[PDB]
Structure 1
Amino acid sequence: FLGRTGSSWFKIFLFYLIFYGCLAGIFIGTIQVLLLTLSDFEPKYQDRVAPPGLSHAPYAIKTEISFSISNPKSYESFVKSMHKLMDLYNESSQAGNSPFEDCSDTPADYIKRGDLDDSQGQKKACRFSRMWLKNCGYAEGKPCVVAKLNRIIGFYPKPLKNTTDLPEELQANYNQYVLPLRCAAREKIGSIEYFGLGGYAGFPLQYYPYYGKRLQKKYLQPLLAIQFTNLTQNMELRIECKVYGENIDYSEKDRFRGRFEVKIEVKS
């Protein structure tokens, strides 16, 4: 033929069949032992998610949400993702004492449901009403963005203490139980309005620590609705929403490390 005879062509096939078969069987074996060394409830390493990311619902083309108020299908793209998220926070999804629980309607302290063990059933998560998100189809004019803190197993988000000076200096400082979120731009051509649990501009600490998908399915993380009823129009406004805390940090590279990058433009 090309290389060899039929007899040789066969033998080279019988070899590579057994050979690659063995190699596949060995590869699988090493994957088995790897998995055997891992927990079902907690990942081996967590230093790469460490400082929590802050992500929002409006799917930004490039950290930007520009549209026209005087146009219907101009914002119907951002309403798709906005709906996708909030559709999960339905009351019909949170039914019965299992696996949900009614928690303080005001920001409270942490809740420990034991260890990362299966020695108990599904760890009961705090309910969250999308109805706590006042004012927010969504904002056809002047968007109503929804913030979110990335989930990390066993992470206890710790707010800053009012020992020294603060950006939003001491205003509504629920020091003990709220992780604040203050959006900014100089360039003050807007109108910041925050909505959340208990009416505070933060995340209620009663939703922590997260026990993971395996130990807490259907779990709901707290949301923080933000509305920009800015009196300006037809210009790119670089708005940055920042979260503050002891366990919260940022990076010049990762522009989502505990903060937002939104470029709103109501070009109408």
Structure 2
Amino acid sequence: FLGRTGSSWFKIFLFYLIFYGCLAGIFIGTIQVLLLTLSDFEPKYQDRVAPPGLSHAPYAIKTEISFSISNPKSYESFVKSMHKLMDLYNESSQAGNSPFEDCSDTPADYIKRGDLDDSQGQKKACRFSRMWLKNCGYAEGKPCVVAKLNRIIGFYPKPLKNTTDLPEELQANYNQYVLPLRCAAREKIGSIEYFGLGGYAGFPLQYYPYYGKRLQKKYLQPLLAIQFTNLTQNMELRIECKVYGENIDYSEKDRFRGRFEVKIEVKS
């Protein structure tokens, strides 16, 4: 033929069949032992998610949400993702004492449901009403963005203490139980309005620590609705929403490390 005879062509097939078969069987074996060394409830390493990311619902083309108020299908793209998220926080999804629980309607302290063990059933998560998100189809004019803190197993978000000076200096400082979120731009051509649990501009600490998908399915993380009823129009406004805390840090590279990058433009 090309290389060899039929007899040789066969033998080279019988070899590579057994050979690659063995190699596949060995590869699988090493994957088995790897998995055997891992927990079902907690990942081996967590230093790469460490400082929590802050992500929002409006799917930004490039950290930007520009549209026209005087146009219907101009914002119907951002309403798709906005709906996708909030559709999960339905009351019909949170039914019965299992696996949900009514928690303080005001920001409270942490809740420990034991260890990362299966020695108990599904760890009961705090309910969250999308109805706590006042004012927010969504904002056809002047968007109503929804913030979110990235989930990390066993992470206890710790707010800053009012020992020294603060950006939003001491205003509504629920020091003990709220992780604040203050959006900014100089360039003050807007109108910041925050909505959340208990009416505070933060995340209620009663939703922590997260026990993971395996130990807490259907779990709901707290949301923080933000509305920009800015009196300006037809210009790119670089708005940055920042979260503050002891366990919260940022990076010049990762522009989502505990903060937002939104470029709103109501070009109408």
- Normalising by the smaller structure, the TM-score range is over 0.9
- Find runs of 4+ consecutive structure 1 residues off by over 6 angstroms: none
Gaps of 5+ in 2: none
SS in structure 1 at match of 2:231: coil
SS in structure 2 at match of 1:231: coil
SS in structure 2 at match of 1:160: coil
CA drift of 1:53 comes to 0.0
CA drift of 1:191 comes to 0.0
CA drift of 1:197 comes to 0.0
Equivalent runs, 1:1-268 vs 2, <5 Å:
1-268=1-268
CA offsets, 1:26-59, max 9 Å, x none? 0000000000000000000000000000000000
- 1-structure distance, mates of 2:211, 2:24: 35
CA offsets, 1:110-143, max 9 Å, x none? 0000000000000000000000000000000000
CA drift of 1:92 comes to 0.0
SS in structure 1 at match of 2:9: helix
CA offsets, 1:6-32, max 9 Å, x none? 000000000000000000000000000
CA offsets, 1:204-255, max 9 Å, x none? 0000000000000000000000000000000000000000000000000000
CA drift of 1:188 comes to 0.0
- 2-structure distance, mates of 1:86, 1:194: 17
CA drift of 1:149 comes to 0.0
SS in structure 2 at match of 1:22: helix
CA RMSD of aligned residues (A): 0.0
Taking structure 2 as the reference length, what is the TM-score of the superposition? 1.00
CA drift of 1:256 comes to 0.0
CA offsets, 1:156-183, max 9 Å, x none? 0000000000000000000000000000
- 2-structure distance, mates of 1:177, 1:46: 24
- 1-structure distance, mates of 2:89, 2:233: 32
- 2-structure distance, mates of 1:114, 1:11: 61
CA drift of 1:72 comes to 0.0
CA offsets, 1:77-126, max 9 Å, x none? 00000000000000000000000000000000000000000000000000
SS in structure 2 at match of 1:31: helix
- 1-structure distance, mates of 2:178, 2:161: 11
- 2-structure distance, mates of 1:183, 1:258: 12
- 2-structure distance, mates of 1:182, 1:86: 22
CA drift of 1:147 comes to 0.0
CA drift of 1:187 comes to 0.0
- 2-structure distance, mates of 1:174, 1:12: 74
- 2-structure distance, mates of 1:158, 1:50: 13
CA drift of 1:76 comes to 0.0
User: How many positions carry a matched residue from both structures?
Assistant: 268
- 2-structure distance, mates of 1:44, 1:134: 40
- 2-structure distance, mates of 1:11, 1:39: 44
SS in structure 2 at match of 1:66: strand
